[PDB]
Design a protein around this motif. Structure first.
Motif, PDB file in Angstrom:
ATOM      1  N   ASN A  76      30.786 -57.663 -26.579  1.00  0.00           N
ATOM      2  CA  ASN A  76      31.820 -57.312 -26.246  1.00  0.00           C
ATOM      3  C   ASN A  76      31.480 -55.495 -26.246  1.00  0.00           C
ATOM      4  OD1 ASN A  76      34.382 -57.447 -24.805  1.00  0.00           O
ATOM      5  ND2 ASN A  76      34.846 -56.447 -26.741  1.00  0.00           N
ATOM      6  N   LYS A  77      31.816 -55.139 -27.255  1.00  0.00           N
ATOM      7  CA  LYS A  77      31.261 -53.826 -27.233  1.00  0.00           C
ATOM      8  C   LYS A  77      29.711 -53.071 -26.133  1.00  0.00           C
ATOM      9  CE  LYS A  77      30.378 -53.234 -31.218  1.00  0.00           C
ATOM     10  NZ  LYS A  77      31.198 -54.934 -32.478  1.00  0.00           N
ATOM     11  N   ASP A  78      28.799 -53.788 -25.765  1.00  0.00           N
ATOM     12  CA  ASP A  78      27.815 -54.165 -24.678  1.00  0.00           C
ATOM     13  C   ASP A  78      28.451 -53.988 -23.612  1.00  0.00           C
ATOM     14  OD1 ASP A  78      26.253 -53.639 -27.473  1.00  0.00           O
ATOM     15  OD2 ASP A  78      24.841 -55.707 -26.692  1.00  0.00           O
ATOM     16  N   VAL A  79      28.961 -54.083 -23.575  1.00  0.00           N
ATOM     17  CA  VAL A  79      30.162 -54.628 -21.782  1.00  0.00           C
ATOM     18  C   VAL A  79      30.064 -53.029 -21.683  1.00  0.00           C
ATOM     19  CG1 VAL A  79      31.678 -55.770 -21.004  1.00  0.00           C
ATOM     20  CG2 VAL A  79      30.068 -57.048 -21.795  1.00  0.00           C
ATOM     21  N   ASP A  80      31.003 -52.519 -22.361  1.00  0.00           N
ATOM     22  CA  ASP A  80      32.867 -52.036 -22.416  1.00  0.00           C
ATOM     23  C   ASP A  80      31.810 -50.388 -22.588  1.00  0.00           C
ATOM     24  OD1 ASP A  80      34.361 -53.545 -23.044  1.00  0.00           O
ATOM     25  OD2 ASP A  80      34.318 -52.968 -26.009  1.00  0.00           O
TER      26      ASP A  80
END
Lengths: 50, 48
Positions: A1-5
């Motif tokens: 999720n952090k990567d996507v963010d």
């Protein structure tokens, strides 16, 4: 999720529309084009006078 | 603007504004031009 963010944050760069081109480089291209158009207008006026 | 000045120079001043009556005392170039205008106007009136 952090990567996507931060992938989304890096690609958007604060604009709702996607920014594939470098934005300040893009407006640099735009101002080069506009100043070139002004110089071309002056040059064509001089060509008409000549 | 330098090219605009160069455009103006050839069009109206090719060394014309660099002369006086003391240099070349006989008659100055504006007087020669005025005499030419008078004579050529007389010729154009006679031709027409």
């Amino acid at each position: 999720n952090k990567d996507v963010d931060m992938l989304c944050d890096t690609l958007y760069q604060g604009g709702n529309q996607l920014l594939l081109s470098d934005q300040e480089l893009t407006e640099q291209f735009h101002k080069v084009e506009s100043q070139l158009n002004k110089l071309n207008h002056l040059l064509t006026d001089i060509l008409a006078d000549v | 603007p330098e090219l605009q000045g160069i455009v103006g120079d050839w069009w109206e001043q090719p060394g014309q504004a660099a002369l006086s009556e003391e240099l070349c005392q006989g008659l100055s170039l504006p007087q020669w031009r005025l005499r030419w205008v008078q004579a050529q106007g007389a010729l154009q009136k006679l031709c027409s």
